[PDB]
Amino acid sequence: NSNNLDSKVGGNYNYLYRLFRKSNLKPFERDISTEIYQAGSTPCNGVEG
Amino acid sequence: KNIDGYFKIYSKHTPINLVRDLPQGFSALEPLVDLPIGINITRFQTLLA
Structure with missing residues (x-):
């Protein structure tokens, strides 16, 4: 601890x-890449979705 | 070779006399260098002078 x-x-x-x-x-x-992972079926780009 | 974070470098140098082709012959490859790096490698390029 x-x-x-x-x-x-x-x-x-x-x-x-x-x-x-x-x-x-x-x-x-x-792994050190920090890209936003599409946790849903919609794709999403930019900084958030 | 790259297996399990380990980069294996095997070599053999030979004096020859041939202008263009790959000769027919047999000589084994001794290991030279291991490197415990840990990269996912997909492509490689050689570099000339």
Whole structure:
């Protein structure tokens, strides 16, 4: 645990993760692309949809 | 070769005497360099002088 080390009362928002992604990944792979994932059947471009 | 984040470099240098063609012969390939990089690679280009 690292509760007292980095967690702040304002909420340590530096700890990010990929929650939405098109497919499962192969072992030993990393991804840093940040494109907006079409979670619905409609396509969407720009900055949000 | 690129398998599981691992880039394998095998080589053989040979003195020859031929102007255009690929000769018929047999000599195995010793491994030279492994690199534990971890990139998804799809294309490659050689570079001349």
